[PDB]
Amino acid sequence: LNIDSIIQRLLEVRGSKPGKNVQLQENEIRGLCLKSREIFLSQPILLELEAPLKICGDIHGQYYDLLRLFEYGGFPPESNYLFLGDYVDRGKQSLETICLLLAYKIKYPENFFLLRGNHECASINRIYGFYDECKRRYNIKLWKTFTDCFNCLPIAAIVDEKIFCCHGGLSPDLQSMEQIRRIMRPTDVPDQGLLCDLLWSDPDKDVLGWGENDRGVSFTFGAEVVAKFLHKHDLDLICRAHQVVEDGYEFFAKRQLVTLFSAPNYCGEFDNAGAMMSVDETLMCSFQILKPA
Amino acid sequence: RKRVTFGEDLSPEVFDESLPANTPLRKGGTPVC
Ligand code: NA
Structure with a gap:
């Protein structure tokens, strides 16, 4: 596996001109998956990071x-860098996107970090583009290899x-950070519970405590939940992704939480930075x- | 003791979707300590 050559390509x-593909060999991509998977498993599922760093939200295959x-x-x-998940689906070049990110994780394992998003899950990326992209350009076996790799991604980070950083948001189940540490990998994303919520929940200004999430998965949570969580854990800020925000970032609960979304003009459908x-x-x-x- | 604060606004990096990734239209602001 020649990581420098892969990165150069x-x-x-x-x-x-934007939109051009990069077609790595299938064995090279398999190698990226296998080596990055080993690194993810060697590092904690709850990352403990130090600033300075730059934190990015969803990319969704918008490689350019x-x-x-x-x-x-x-x-x-x-x-x-710390990325908050959602490397694949929706955009046209999930493969180049995830390959570059995995290559950088292998090249700079202590200076480059990737969290799991709700799209790094086979049941989701089966239907929102990544499976189709893998099948068209490579094969289904490669998609399964990505799944095995994604099943090992860490799910939160504290800087x-x-x-406190995660893709989705808080969980009513999250009382102690050790609950995150005790989660074993590889794992799929369950249809409910702590890991699900960390990848799926959303803040909501109209919710009192915990409420319905009309994604049909997980919960919404209100400003008071954010304040109580920060105070309990002596934290200052929650940083999460998972929702399109017009300006690329958006505060919630008097700057106690921020949402980042890093794919501009998402899907060619939204008016966002x-x-x-x-x-x-x-x-x-x-x-x-x-x-x- | 370290505590979160927020820096001044930074002007955006502006890009044309049809132009190469290495030629932004306008350079955005970068943070300094
Ligand atoms: Na900690």
Whole structure:
């Protein structure tokens, strides 16, 4: 597995008319999956990270936008990165997107981090594009290899004991961080419970405590739940992704929670910028916005 | 002790969807300590 060669081939399209494919060999992609899987299992399921770092929300196969985000934020290892999940589905180039991200995880294992999103799950990415993309360009066996890899992704991160990061949101089940640590991998995403909620829940201004989530999975949670969670755990901020937000980032509950969504003009359907949150060594957080003309 | 604070707004990096990823239309602001 020649990681430098793989990265070079993936990045060769930075100067191309957008939309061009990069077709790695199937065995190379299998190698990315297998080596990254080993690394994910060797690191905690609840990551403990230190600033400075840049935190990104959903990418959803918008590969050229990922390249634009790295151009703005600095390509690894110039900046340390934490991604909050949702690398695949919806966009046209899930394969290039996840291959570049896994390649960077292998190249910079202590400076580059990927969390699990709700789309890094076979039952979801079977229907929202990734299975079809794998079948068309490669084969179903490759899709199953990705599934085995995704089943090993970590599911939350805490930055400097102050910023709690996950793809979806809080869970009524989450009382102690050790509950996250005790989750064994590989695992699928269950249809309910703590891991499900960390990938699926959403904040809601109209909910008192915990409420219905009309995704048909997990819960909504209100501002008071956020405040109580932060106070209980001596945290300052929840950083999550999972919903399109017009400006690329959006605060909730008097800046106690922020949503990041990093795929601009999502699906060619939404009027949104993408953003990442840059966290400096003092935990001063800034938003770098990638905005379509 | 470290505590979360928020920095000044940064002007966006503006891009044209039809242009290469290595040629942004306008460079966005970058944070400094
Ligand atoms: Na901790």
